[PDB]
Design a protein around this ligand. Sequence first.
Ligand code: BCL
Ligand code: BCL
Ligand code: BCL
Ligand code: BCL
Ligand SMILES: CC[C@H]1c2cc3[nH]c4c(c3C)C(=O)[C@H](C(=O)OC)c4c3nc(cc4[nH]c(cc(n2)[C@@H]1C)c(C(C)=O)c4C)[C@@H](C)[C@@H]3CCC(=O)OC/C=C(\C)CCC[C@H](C)CCC[C@H](C)CCCC(C)C
Ligand SMILES: CC[C@H]1c2cc3[nH]c4c(c3C)C(=O)[C@H](C(=O)OC)c4c3nc(cc4[nH]c(cc(n2)[C@@H]1C)c(C(C)=O)c4C)[C@@H](C)[C@@H]3CCC(=O)OC/C=C(\C)CCC[C@H](C)CCC[C@H](C)CCCC(C)C
Ligand SMILES: COC(C)(C)C/C=C/C(C)=C/C=C/C(C)=C/C=C/C(C)=C\C=C\C=C(C)\C=C\C=C(/C)CC/C=C(\C)CCC=C(C)C
Ligand SMILES: CCCCCCCCCCCC[N+](C)(C)[O-]
Ligand SMILES: CCCCCCCCCCCC[N+](C)(C)[O-]
Ligand SMILES: CCCCCCCCCCCC[N+](C)(C)[O-]
Ligand SMILES: CCCCCCCCCCCC[N+](C)(C)[O-]
Ligand SMILES: [Fe+3]
Lengths: 281, 239, 302
Amino acid sequence: ALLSFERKYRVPGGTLVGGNLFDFWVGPFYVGFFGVATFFFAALGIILIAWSAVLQGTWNPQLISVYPPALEYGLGGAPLAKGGLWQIITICATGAFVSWALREVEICRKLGIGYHIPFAFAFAILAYLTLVLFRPVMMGAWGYAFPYGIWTHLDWVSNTGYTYGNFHYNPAHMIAISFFFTNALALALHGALVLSAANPEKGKEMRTEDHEDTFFRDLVGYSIGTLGIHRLGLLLSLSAVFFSALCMIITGTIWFDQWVDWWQWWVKLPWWANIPGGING
Amino acid sequence: DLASLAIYSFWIFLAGLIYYLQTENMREGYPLENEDGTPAANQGPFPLPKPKTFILPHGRGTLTVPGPESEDRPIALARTAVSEGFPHAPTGDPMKDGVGPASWVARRDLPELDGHGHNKIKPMKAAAGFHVSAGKNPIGLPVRGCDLEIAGKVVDIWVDIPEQMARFLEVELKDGSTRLLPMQMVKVQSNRVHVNALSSDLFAGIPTIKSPTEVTLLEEDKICGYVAGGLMYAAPKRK
Amino acid sequence: AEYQNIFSQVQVRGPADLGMTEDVNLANRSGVGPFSTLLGWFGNAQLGPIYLGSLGVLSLFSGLMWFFTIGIWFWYQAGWNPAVFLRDLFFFSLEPPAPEYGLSFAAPLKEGGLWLIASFFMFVAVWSWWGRTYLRAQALGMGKHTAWAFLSAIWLWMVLGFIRPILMGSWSEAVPYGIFSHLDWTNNFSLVHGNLFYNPFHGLSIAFLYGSALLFAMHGATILAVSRFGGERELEQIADRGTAAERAALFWRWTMGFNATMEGIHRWAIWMAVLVTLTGGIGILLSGTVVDNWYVWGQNHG
Ligand code: BCL
Ligand code: BCL
Ligand code: BCL
Ligand code: BCL
Ligand SMILES: CC[C@H]1c2cc3[nH]c4c(c3C)C(=O)[C@H](C(=O)OC)c4c3nc(cc4[nH]c(cc(n2)[C@@H]1C)c(C(C)=O)c4C)[C@@H](C)[C@@H]3CCC(=O)OC/C=C(\C)CCC[C@H](C)CCC[C@H](C)CCCC(C)C
Ligand SMILES: CC[C@H]1c2cc3[nH]c4c(c3C)C(=O)[C@H](C(=O)OC)c4c3nc(cc4[nH]c(cc(n2)[C@@H]1C)c(C(C)=O)c4C)[C@@H](C)[C@@H]3CCC(=O)OC/C=C(\C)CCC[C@H](C)CCC[C@H](C)CCCC(C)C
Ligand SMILES: COC(C)(C)C/C=C/C(C)=C/C=C/C(C)=C/C=C/C(C)=C\C=C\C=C(C)\C=C\C=C(/C)CC/C=C(\C)CCC=C(C)C
Ligand SMILES: CCCCCCCCCCCC[N+](C)(C)[O-]
Ligand SMILES: CCCCCCCCCCCC[N+](C)(C)[O-]
Ligand SMILES: CCCCCCCCCCCC[N+](C)(C)[O-]
Ligand SMILES: CCCCCCCCCCCC[N+](C)(C)[O-]
Ligand SMILES: [Fe+3]
């Protein structure tokens, strides 16, 4: 149940709430107050989803789906069978995630490390909260949120998308894709670099971080270095989810027309608006 | 049809990949133990990988993992309960005994060498051509602890030569002796360098290096260990 | 506010680094370029030296030819008018030869011949840069990981513009060169194959893309959190595990019940990323060759 080096780290302390009450492990898992909070919130949510499954008449996970209140109910409550089960599960999900982040902060404190991980997780929590809370509230109904089903949530993506034409043309959505594609380029490279250094040819000695920098300078005339590539990855990632949240918080609220047509601010600039030729004249 | 063969094939590939990946990540720390250091009964479903051997550069030898796991040091901790899963209390001074957030591991007592074979981390005085090229130069600045007293003054920056990066500040105490603080644990301000982790009276306790122009991997681990452990243990002296 | 280590507090410059020698022909390495104080707050300041052998220059010539061929066409469409060129920049497009010409090289330039020309150029550019990626590693004695990983990116590219156009018997199946037009193609593609959300490879590609942002967020943040024990010195932490590696492993074990090693996390990382374009290229390759409609296929898998 313990890694060979683990015992020296399993000391008392670091908890945020409750003192030594919940200061222990179950197998490998740390508990803490927020470990208890996570189980509670997760069990409730799972029970509500099972109970939402009986009202629907399937126990097939590819079919099960928990829909928001329809637009008619606005930002108010709804009867469980048609809206309220979602609204409560959403509270139970939010409760599971925030609790989970805060549980990571307690694990951080006992291990004497920085808080970068909880901090990064809170960006994912924020993207979720944009779709199920922030954008719904700004729009005027929980019904604009997305449904908890495996394929039904994909349907919501497709229909929300096409409500605005080809959703490619959301300019904040363009930026977010860039970071996503770039963050994966970077992850492929970082992993390949370290492994090619750690695992050289045949009976060659283990290469060094100098060889890693040489290799990249050889290749593209620059190398960012080990502290740098880890600062980069954290940044591309967190940036991708930042612009994701952005592209949705503006869709349906400040812009609600076809996204392709927004790009006419550029083409109708008076300097070139009328000049003949091209595509737009 | 072709597409159904492909997806079914993929799922089987992915399972062998996850298996390969998980056994790869078992080359350290395993086998699992009970809190008394004996081999635990349930190891889980994955077997240990066949050992692999790194040929270390610079004639430093060989590493084979997985291999015999031992701490190679005393752990000053004692059980607080009769069953598995509870905290193990420090039996002395956790800072001094090197437990908890103050843990270090017995790494080799040589310094890290760069690609060419030279010490990776030098003081800047012995680092030919290296200079502070941006930001406030910390050298000459007083150093403050988390109790708002002064503990020392910065006499040099120890640099990573290949990374071209500041890793430590060398600090002089009332003794006239010096210590290393890690860059990552200090706030370089305009009139001072501030240290949140440690209070002034704990600076004397920082592990000293045995030779004043190089640090070893063992000494780096004891120093970084000691000052991170202060965030927890020096906290009856913070705010 | 404790120091978070996202930007350096103090930069430090020394003699320009000319790198390891091993087996590299130094005749081809350029001179160290300038030093960027800007870059240096985040990463290395040295814009130091790039190697340029025979493959490197073949790559850079082909790459510029591709870039210029599309550009002169963009001007032809703009009527050589600089204002229109800048106005309609995202709207211009170099389109493939129409379905009539099939897989032939006999189309007029003002009807897809320029497309073939640019594509030939991009083709040599990419494979020569791949060979460069392999050779640069062998000179240094390092494993071929970066080359293998790059092959996976090449796979998707290879399928979108070459392999799948050939299995369909037409160059008109390939992607046009244009900002807005290559987007319209993408949207059109899903529509014509019965919605790609039903392609089980597309959804796997998505999981890996998402998982890459998850993993790198996890890893990057983890190395920063244990950079106070010299975590970023990953290769030495591989040969001689320190408390950085242990605390990192232990955070995750106490969170989710399992953990990686310092080497092992990079095996997770290369694969998560690699499987993005690997699964993606299979899902595109099958689209229109074997499956006409992913809705239909999904209804009765077969
Ligand atoms: C899913 C695969 C689809 C596809 C779907 C999309 C979608 C959807 C989007 C893009 C986007 C992009 N695509 Mg595409 N794209 C495909 C195949 C390609 C290929 C190719 C295979 O050779 C190329 C060269 C491109 C190139 C491009 C860039 C113009 C842009 C950013 C890429 C990036 O972030 O790289 C990261 C790494 C690099 C090293 C970048 C270097 C390449 C240069 C050309 C990028 C310039 C970016 C620019 C400065 C900022 C964005 C544009 C501004 C908002 C105006 N695509 C196929 C057809 N592509 C995004 C876009 O913003 O387009 C307008 C976007 O939303
Ligand atoms: C993110 C922007 C859009 C969206 C667009 C898409 C698109 C587009 C696709 C998915 C796909 C997926 N989505 Mg989605 N999805 C959204 C929000 C979510 C949220 C949420 C915010 O809570 C969840 C839990 C998911 C979860 C999922 C997975 C079922 C699936 C695999 C992706 C993945 O590998 O993640 C990366 C993370 C990891 C690899 C870590 C492991 C995470 C695992 C896989 C989570 C599965 C849990 C799931 C079965 C729910 C269990 C709940 C209770 C425990 C019972 N999506 C919103 C609405 N999603 C893909 C799919 O395959 O469709 C079915 C797909 O094509
Ligand atoms: C037909 C579809 C439309 C379209 C409509 C939309 C719409 C509408 C949306 C996007 C969104 C996104 N689009 Mg789009 N999009 C299209 C085509 C594309 C293309 C392309 C063509 O190549 C690409 C690459 C993208 C890419 C993207 C991303 C930028 C973004 C999703 C990432 C995200 O938000 O993560 C964010 C991550 C999360 C929310 C996950 C949070 C996870 C939480 C915190 C924890 C889960 C715990 C879990 C339950 C535990 C389970 C595991 C165990 C059981 C414990 N789109 C076309 C034009 N797109 C989405 C977006 O931007 O969201 C803001 C969005 O809603
Ligand atoms: C309306 C749009 C359709 C749709 C149609 C498509 C199509 C069509 C495709 C994808 C593909 C992808 N889509 Mg989709 N997609 C939709 C909705 C989504 C959503 C969502 C709504 O949330 C998401 C998250 C995604 C996500 C994704 C990615 C997982 C995947 C591309 C991976 C990649 O990294 O390519 C980026 C990488 C590359 C293109 C390879 C680049 C390699 C080359 C060698 C690099 C360029 C070199 C060159 C010489 C230039 C260098 C110089 C520079 C110019 C400076 N799609 C809907 C259903 N999607 C692709 C796929 O994989 O299908 C399964 C695909 O082709
Ligand atoms: C910066 C954002 C990026 C990122 C980072 C990130 N995610 C993280 C972290 C970080 C830094 C962690 O520390 C944490 C982690 O522990 O990883 C292993 C985590 C995590 N990211 C996860 C998933 C995840 N992250 C995602 C995305 C992203 N995470 C981005 C790429 C996605 C996407 C792309 O969709 C998913 C699916 C988890 C593995 C984990 C958090 C686990 C957790 O919060 O546990 C508490 C909750 C439960 C045990 C279950 C609660 C269940 C609910 C009560 C009911 C179900 C509600 C739900 C809405 C159902 C919806 C299902 C349908 C949509 C199919
Ligand atoms: C698993 C796939 C993922 C990935 C991985 C990946 N890509 C890779 C690699 C890997 C592992 C490499 O090793 C290789 C690389 O070289 O990395 C730096 C590469 C690479 N991925 C690239 C791009 C790229 N990869 C992409 C995607 C992906 N790559 C995925 C995220 C995309 C997308 C998102 O579409 C892009 C845009 C290149 C940077 C590089 C390969 C470069 C190449 O082959 O081109 C040859 C050379 C030229 C075309 C030169 C001409 C360039 C310009 C047209 C002219 C301008 C430059 C000129 C020098 C003048 C400058 C003047 C300025 C004022 C403009
Ligand atoms: C400023 O003024 C100048 C002069 C600089 C000109 C300006 C340049 C401009 C405006 C350049 C703009 C170019 C753009 C925006 C290009 C955009 C491309 C995009 C967005 C996507 C690219 C996708 C294309 C792919 C997937 C192509 C794949 C190609 C292959 C797989 C190879 C295909 C090869 C063919 C068919 C030939 C085969 C031949 C043989 C003999 C093997
Ligand atoms: C989704 C992957 C979860 C991996 C967690 C693996 C933990 C295994 C712990 C087994 C020992 C027993 N336990 C849970 C009773 O304490
Ligand atoms: C279970 C049947 C076998 C399925 C295929 C398994 C694929 C394993 C992928 C990892 C191989 C790794 N490698 C090349 C480093 O050895
Ligand atoms: C995408 C997630 C894949 C998870 C694969 C399964 C990981 C569980 C492995 C547990 C091994 C460890 N343990 C606790 C027994 O030591
Ligand atoms: C269809 C072509 C796909 C090419 C994929 C090549 C696999 C490379 C996998 C990453 C490098 C792996 N490693 C360490 C096992 O060698
Ligand atoms: Fe790393």
